[PDB]
Design a protein around this ligand. Structure first.
Ligand code: E3Z
Lengths: 334, 20
């Protein structure tokens, strides 16, 4: 408790200085060369690039400014860049550079060579509890960090977790992250992962991330999420019902932890009580977890990637840059 | 099985987040 308090107070000082004075326009597209397209997002693509001068590799997220305004995602995109450039933690993807041109926003991000946890999870089916526990522990520590900065993440799911060269997790995509004291209201995130108070238009706080952790651990350990259906509105009905069925292979400790994370009552949800994150860290399902060893990356990982590509292939298309500046006013602080 | 029902659903690929 005594040193964790001073760790977090120094981390908050570091964060606030960058939050109040964000880095802006720290690179240009011509400094980078495309290797391959890594995936696609709501407003554009993610590409693996090499820095021509240094040789370093990065993931470059490209956002079409016109698609962002049209999807009314301007403030979320501004949130995303300002927050991600200001945070620093072992399990968060770093935002190394950002810039814009006439058509697009560019976020040059730390590259995770192991690819998407989503791909690995779907391919193998489900993770063992020890393997799921190893990843869950990194999310617990990351949320403890982020929440101490008054940040809510709001989009925890396998799709947003990457595997690095050591087999550890990196949280990518701050597209819905938000700095708020108190409560917020935006219906956003992914249906399967939405806490009930998001659906019920009640206002909500950082406790929604602890709920999403429950959904994540369940999906890693079961191979499917606790609430699924063909259409989002049927998913929402199961979420507010407050009924979870567990596979028979789930341990009692796992079921107990999940009942306390997938807790509809905010005054009872783990992570939201007087002891905060310590109710999670001291839960019996985490009995084998050395929390400091996880933070220091001294624990053996469930699997190590092998760099040479069993990653997904995408068609390579040109990055179109209009001769006329688009949406300049909306994105002036980016 | 629950797993078969999931695999037969339309929501086993990368899931879009709702913006609104
Ligand atoms: C729908 C895509 C999605 O949800 N997330 C996604 C997909 C591709 C790339 C990224 N972002 C990233 N991806 C990597 N590494 C990597 C990804 C796929 C295959 C091999 C390596 N590294 C950093 C980022 Cl910031 C995020």
């Amino acid at each position: 408790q005594e040193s964790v308090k001073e760790f977090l107070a120094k981390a908050k000082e570091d964060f606030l200085k960058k939050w109040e004075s964000p880095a802006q326009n720290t690179a240009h597209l011509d400094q980078f060369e495309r290797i391959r397209t890594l995936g696609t997002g709501s407003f554009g693509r993610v590409m693996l690039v090499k820095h021509k001068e240094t040789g370093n590799h990065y993931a470059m997220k490209i956002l079409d400014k016109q698609k962002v305004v049209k999807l009314k995602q301007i403030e979320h995109t501004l949130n995303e860049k300002r927050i991600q450039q200001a945070v620093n933690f072992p399990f968060l993807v770093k935002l190394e550079f950002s810039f814009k041109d006439n058509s697009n926003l560019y976020m040059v991000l730390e590259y995770a060579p192991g690819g998407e946890m989503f791909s690995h999870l779907r391919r193998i089916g489900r993770f063992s509890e020890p393997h799921a526990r190893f990843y869950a522990a990194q999310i617990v520590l990351t949320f403890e960090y982020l929440h101490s900065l008054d940040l809510i993440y709001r989009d925890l799911k396998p799709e947003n977790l990457l595997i690095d060269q050591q087999g550890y997790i990196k949280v990518a995509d701050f597209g819905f992250a938000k700095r708020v004291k108190g409560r917020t209201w935006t219906l956003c995130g992914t249906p399967e992962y939405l806490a009930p108070e998001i659906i019920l238009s009640k206002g909500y706080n950082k406790a929604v991330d602890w709920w999403a952790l429950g959904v994540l651990i369940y999906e890693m350990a079961a191979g499917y999420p606790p609430f699924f259906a063909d259409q989002p509105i049927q998913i929402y009905e199961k979420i507010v019902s407050g009924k979870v069925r567990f596979p028979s292979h789930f341990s009692s400790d796992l079921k107990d932890l999940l009942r306390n994370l997938l807790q509809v009552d905010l005054t009872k949800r783990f992570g939201n009580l007087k002891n905060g994150v310590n109710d999670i860290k001291n839960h019996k399902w985490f009995a084998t977890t050395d929390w400091i060893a996880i933070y220091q990356r001294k624990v053996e990982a469930p699997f190590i990637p092998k760099f040479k590509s069993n990653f997904d292939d995408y068609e390579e298309e040109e990055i179109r840059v209009s001769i006329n500046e688009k949406c300049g006013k909306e994105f002036s602080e980016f | 099985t629950t797993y078969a029902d999931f695999i037969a659903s339309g929501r086993t690929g990368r899931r879009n987040a709702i913006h609104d």
